[PDB]
Amino acid sequence: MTIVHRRLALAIGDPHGIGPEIALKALQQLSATERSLIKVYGPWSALEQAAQICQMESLLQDLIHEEAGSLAQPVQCGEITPQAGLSTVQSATAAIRACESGEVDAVIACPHHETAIHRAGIAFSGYPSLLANVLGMNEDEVFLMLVGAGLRIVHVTLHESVRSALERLSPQLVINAVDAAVQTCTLLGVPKPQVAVFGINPHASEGQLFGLEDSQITVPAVETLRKRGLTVDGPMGADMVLAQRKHDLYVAMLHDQGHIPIKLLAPNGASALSIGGRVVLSSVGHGSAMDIAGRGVADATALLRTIALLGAQ
Amino acid sequence: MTIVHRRLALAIGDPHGIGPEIALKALQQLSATERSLIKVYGPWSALEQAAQICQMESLLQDLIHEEAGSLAQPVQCGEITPQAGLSTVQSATAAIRACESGEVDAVIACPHHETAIHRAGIAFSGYPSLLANVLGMNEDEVFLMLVGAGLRIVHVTLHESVRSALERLSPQLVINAVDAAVQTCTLLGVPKPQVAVFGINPHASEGQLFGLEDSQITVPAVETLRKRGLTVDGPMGADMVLAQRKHDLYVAMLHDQGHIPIKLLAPNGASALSIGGRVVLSSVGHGSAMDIAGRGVADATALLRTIALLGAQ
Ligand SMILES: O=C(O)c1cccc(O)c1
Ligand SMILES: [Cl-]
Ligand SMILES: [Zn+2]
Ligand SMILES: [Zn+2]
Numbered sequence A, B: 001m002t003i004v005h006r007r008l009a010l011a012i013g014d015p016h017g018i019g020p021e022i023a024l025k026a027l028q029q030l031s032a033t034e035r036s037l038i039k040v041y042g043p044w045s046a047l048e049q050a051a052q053i054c055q056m057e058s059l060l061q062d063l064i065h066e067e068a069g070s071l072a073q074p075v076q077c078g079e080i081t082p083q084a085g086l087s088t089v090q091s092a093t094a095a096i097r098a099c100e101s102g103e104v105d106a107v108i109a110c111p112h113h114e115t116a117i118h119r120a121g122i123a124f125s126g127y128p129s130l131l132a133n134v135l136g137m138n139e140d141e142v143f144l145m146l147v148g149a150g151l152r153i154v155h156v157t158l159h160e161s162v163r164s165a166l167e168r169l170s171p172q173l174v175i176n177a178v179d180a181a182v183q184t185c186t187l188l189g190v191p192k193p194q195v196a197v198f199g200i201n202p203h204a205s206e207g208q209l210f211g212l213e214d215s216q217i218t219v220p221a222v223e224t225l226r227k228r229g230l231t232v233d234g235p236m237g238a239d240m241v242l243a244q245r246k247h248d249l250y251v252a253m254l255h256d257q258g259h260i261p262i263k264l265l266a267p268n269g270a271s272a273l274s275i276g277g278r279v280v281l282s283s284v285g286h287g288s289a290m291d292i293a294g295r296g297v298a299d300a301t302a303l304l305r306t307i308a309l310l311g312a313q
Helices: A019-028 A044-054 A057-061 A082-101 A114-119 A127-135 A162-168 A171-188 A202-207 A218-227 A237-246 A256-263 A299-310 B019-029 B032-036 B043-053 B056-060 B082-101 B114-119 B127-135 B164-166 B169-188 B203-206 B218-227 B240-243 B255-263 B300-309
Strands: A007-010 A038-042 A062-065 A107-108 A143-148 A151-155 A195-198 A234-238 A250-251 A271-276 A281-285 B008-011 B038-042 B064-065 B106-109 B142-147 B153-154 B196-199 B230-235 B249-254 B271-274 B279-283
Touching: A019 A038, A019 A044, A019 A127, A019 A299, A019 B230, A038 A044, A038 A082, A044 A057, A044 B043, A082 A107, A082 A114, A082 A127, A107 A299, A114 B203, A127 A281, A143 A171, A143 A256, A143 B218, A162 B142, A171 A195, A171 A218, A171 A250, A171 A271, A171 A281, A171 A299, A195 A237, A195 B142, A202 A234, A202 B038, A202 B255, A218 A234, A234 A237, A237 A250, A250 A256, A256 B203, A256 B255, A271 A299, A281 A299, A281 B196, B008 B019, B008 B300, B019 B038, B019 B056, B019 B300, B032 B038, B032 B106, B038 B043, B038 B082, B043 B056, B043 B064, B043 B169, B043 B230, B082 B106, B082 B114, B082 B127, B082 B279, B106 B300, B127 B271, B127 B279, B142 B169, B142 B240, B142 B255, B153 B255, B164 B218, B169 B196, B169 B218, B169 B249, B169 B271, B169 B300, B196 B218, B196 B240, B203 B230, B218 B230, B230 B240, B240 B249, B249 B255, B271 B300, B279 B300
Parallel strands: A007 A038, A007 A107, A038 A062, A107 A281, A151 A250, A195 A234, A195 A250, B008 B038, B008 B106, B038 B064, B106 B279, B153 B249, B196 B230, B196 B249
Antiparallel strands: A143 A151, A143 A271, A271 A281, B142 B153, B142 B271, B271 B279
């Protein structure tokens, strides 16, 4: 059963966490062919460590690898350290640049630890942010798509107050989100997708009966996107459109509009794709699990699910 | 077998639609005891009509009834007429007032026809509205609870712009919604429920990192509600807490937060309860079906489901 149909970068995330271990356990389960399509970014010491523990030294031989986020000392499984924090960001940066340059077609990031990154003195507010800084983009120009249970929902705004999001919403910002998500849909195996744009207000403002925002923002944006020859319905009330379940891509205006349905239908296994330029980066949907790091009992399922997602045709 | 454990009003809705017929067909299936707990509001001519057609004249004898929304002419099954429109609103008003006065404990409305009501020169924007006008309350002092697929979600704000809702949100408004919903949960058969309060902002503001609103509004409200001895978790991010699926009552801050999950999980078989003062009003989940009125084609299932819901214990 082939699940990898294209070149991917895998940053092994925090080298003290379970990231290295799940990386090896996921790769272990693929064919030789599939494994050569995945290039692994991270400190080799960490991968050697996880090979001892999981007993997969044979696997290291055939791994395609680039040293990134090298360590100045032995690995300390379980420990939160600034060096591990830097390592994380360096690996992800190496991977992201490989995607930028075209060497790979998408990126997967194994789990980070935020405290670790913070103690390294690095500003980190999620992968959308990192992606922007590395690529030289405004954070506003990079979006998060959640994927889970058949649903794909790009969010035009994300981790800010509702008020702050409304102040920022514009025709252009929406257009940008759709363009980013459409490019991303090509990668996910849906070339020319059906798009539904959520209303900002209930019932998509109901004309102008429940606020003016939709006639100023979503409506103009949808008209501009149709004229450029995209199949776009909306704005329509998020509740009503979602329930029809007949679009390949929904476009949410606020974090909660897209996050509520996703976590309800796919409460464990939803993948979080940061999109910006040609670079699509997915986290695994779980933490660094410092408690069990080095103990060799971590599950690669979430990782494998993510590979399957970013690696279909 | 027994589904009616309490006194209820049933307004028969549009007397030209299927409302009268389903009223009779629902009552027909209950026991003598159950039938004496349901008082029917509406024109007697309409009930006589539907008795001829469905062949249930024997049933009219047993019925507890109050004439409301009398007609000036014979019933015209299938026809949209302003008289039928007025009749609808009068029956519902009679029913609501019987609930206000304490003669009954909750109210069910059989289907209306909006065009009919509009042509009578009456403003009708849903049952939340009507309930307010009749009881002498602002529309913001009536809350809407959606019920479907095990979820109960009262909304603190409803049919207004997101910004307008945030402007209006207060500790008191939330407390009010919960008090209304809790009283309503007693009626629904869940005396002492587990309550979850949604955050206004993503991740419930994340302390104050994503806006101040939750520390001003939801957090104080939850503390005040615990002090009065209610089991209340939150505020938590709506996405995360819903997915745990461990509470009898969720409290949404905005229309979409509560409407999205409900429509997704229960595209059919959901109930909309309007709560205000002691009055709990539910519609049946369907239209007046003018094309089949008088034709003996409609089932009472949706009506009976609603009776079962408002008549638990
Ligand atoms: O828009 C709503 O308030 C609503 C409430 C219940 C059912 C429905 O289809 C819509
Ligand atoms: Cl009675
Ligand atoms: Zn989030
Ligand atoms: Zn609505």
